[PDB]
Write a protein that binds this ligand. Sequence first.
Ligand code: ZN
Ligand code: ZN
Lengths: 110, 83, 50, 49, 48, 48, 48, 49, 215
Amino acid sequence: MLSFCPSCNNMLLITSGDSGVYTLACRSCPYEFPIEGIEIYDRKKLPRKEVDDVLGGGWDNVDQTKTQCPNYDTCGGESAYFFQLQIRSADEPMTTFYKCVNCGHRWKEN
Amino acid sequence: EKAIPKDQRATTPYMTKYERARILGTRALQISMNAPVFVDLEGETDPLRIAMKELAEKKIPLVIRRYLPDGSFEDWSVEELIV
Amino acid sequence: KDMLYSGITGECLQAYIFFGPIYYQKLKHMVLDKMHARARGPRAVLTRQP
Amino acid sequence: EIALFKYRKARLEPGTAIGAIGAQSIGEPGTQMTLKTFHFAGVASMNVT
Amino acid sequence: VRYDNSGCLVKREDLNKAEYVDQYDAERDFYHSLREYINGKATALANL
Amino acid sequence: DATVPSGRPETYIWRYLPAPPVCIRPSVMMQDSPASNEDDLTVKLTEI
Amino acid sequence: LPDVVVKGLPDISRAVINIRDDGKRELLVEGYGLRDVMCTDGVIGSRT
Amino acid sequence: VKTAETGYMSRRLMKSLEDLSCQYDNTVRTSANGIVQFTYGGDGLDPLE
Amino acid sequence: MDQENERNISRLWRAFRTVKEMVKDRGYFITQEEVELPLEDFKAKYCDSMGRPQRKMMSFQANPTEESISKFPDMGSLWVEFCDEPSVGVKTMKTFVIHIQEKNFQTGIFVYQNNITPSAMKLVPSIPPATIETFNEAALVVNITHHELVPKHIRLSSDEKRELLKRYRLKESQLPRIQRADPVALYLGLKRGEVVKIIRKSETSGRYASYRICM
DNA sequence: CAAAATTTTCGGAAGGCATGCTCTGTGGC
DNA sequence: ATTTTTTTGCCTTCCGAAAATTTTG
RNA sequence: GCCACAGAG
Ligand SMILES: [Zn+2]
Ligand SMILES: [Zn+2]
């Protein structure tokens, strides 16, 4: 929150006050800005860097299976592209990645 | 009572380089103090070369007392040691 | 590369010798000022060492 | 005979100051070592010391 | 001779186990290698 | 260790200062003055 | 808040996947969490 | 500049390794008669030989 | 769900396998078939119907083998227990100590989940004849004695230790030392004064034996 | 249950050491 | 009685302060 | 004598 008092260009701070309601108040000059029914937010959009789909491109020319997608209330697709991958230890089951062909929303299981 | 008998000797029968050096130094110090020699010295004067000649055909009167770390010692005749 | 006869045996050297003037400098470090030998001599008053 | 003689004379002779020998045999290559830049198995972003 | 940690003789069935490794094994290893080398030479002659 | 007479805590507090022999704090020979310079230990001893 | 760690080990600076000479892939990291790496599933703890 | 650090490294290594020696029972021991190695290098062979 | 349940079950299963291997390596009677207990049988045996880990069920007792009691005549049965609390205080530690003392166990292996308070670490030597060893589930996910760097440690009996000291003609204070709270010493449960023989594999010579003493 | 005593953990500062090994000269206090 | 620095790294011990844990009421 | 730089390998 970076806002400055229009009267004297000094930094504005938020205090609780006696009433318990927050206001944008200036500690230098007699100025306040109540926010009852008014929204204030200082959004800090963090930078987003491009990421490669580490599982993308693997659902091409592979066998299909008859598994219902979890979003059954929105669609009823049955055929899904499935394949097997070992991403765990050798003494526990080798996981399956399978994606619906109609709605996307990829998901995996063990 | 700490002497290991001659039959039960376990240390290697080869004379180490340090034993050779100490034996030569001791014999040269003895000869430099007018000790008799047991070789036919051919005009040699330096005690160290006389000591080397004495060791050459094993005519030197000393023995080596090797201390094992426990405390028992082991006596080896210099003429017995293989060089 | 000149062809030099050796002064010891007189025969021609079997390789041509790179022969010519080079500027050489005599440096100030001479062995007359560097040689030293002690045997016994003065000793320090505190530690009684040379 | 030759093999047995070479083996029996290759033993560490008692009384050897082997610790000092090892200390020198480790320190002296440190003198001979020049400082170079290395990397860990073909990737240039490591620069392992 | 190979002695166990207790201090008695070791049976032939378990001479090469880990807990019976002594200080002389290197010597034994040397002898084995020596024999192997000689055996190799003999094998070569046999092949000829 | 309290088995010896000198093994007490009060030994580690300065009560008697042993003045060192002058053979280990000797007076330096003269350089340009008839007087002789003294070691720092002797001067500190006089100050004490 | 945007500097908190939500996943991964707190001491691992970075991680790379190296393809070795024989073609198999190994995962080599910069950090001080050896136990957490060798306890992580998918990583052989007996060869790390 | 490498000699300045290498000299200190050699001094530390020797002041830590000077006391060891090979005893007459082929066990490497410190000056206080404590074993560091039961046989030198596992086989008791001199690197020099 | 997946992350909170299956990963925890797999970690607990691997910790159980490591604990079984540790108890087997001490000479206690554990059959070979019990240490490769697969995840399916572990779920069918020690897990709840809805899919929860029942750590009170997986606590058990171990008895020495005839070979171990032949070599070590003073060895008795142990009781290994897994705690359900995330952080153990002094109440549950005192309860475990009271259980160990009441059932007359020579030693007891305690496996906490997240952390142990420092007030309980000073309560472990409370029993004079018995000893208590505390382990972490995270520290038991992977076995350290199966690592390629760690060589074979084999603890020696009193007779074997005396034979070694007579063979090399030395007092026990002159041997190389291994600390207690060392990971391998904790794994094998060495007490003070015990001597362990270590089989080192050097490329120069082959296999050679070294010795260490616990301190 | 939360107030009070005890113990542990965590920092920043305060100390210390290193900053080769030998050797040859001068100049000023 | 205005007022520069002049290598760089590594290491242990100390010592309040705050946090964590147990212990009294 | 103490400091101070200057060089040699
Ligand atoms: Zn204002
Ligand atoms: Zn779908």
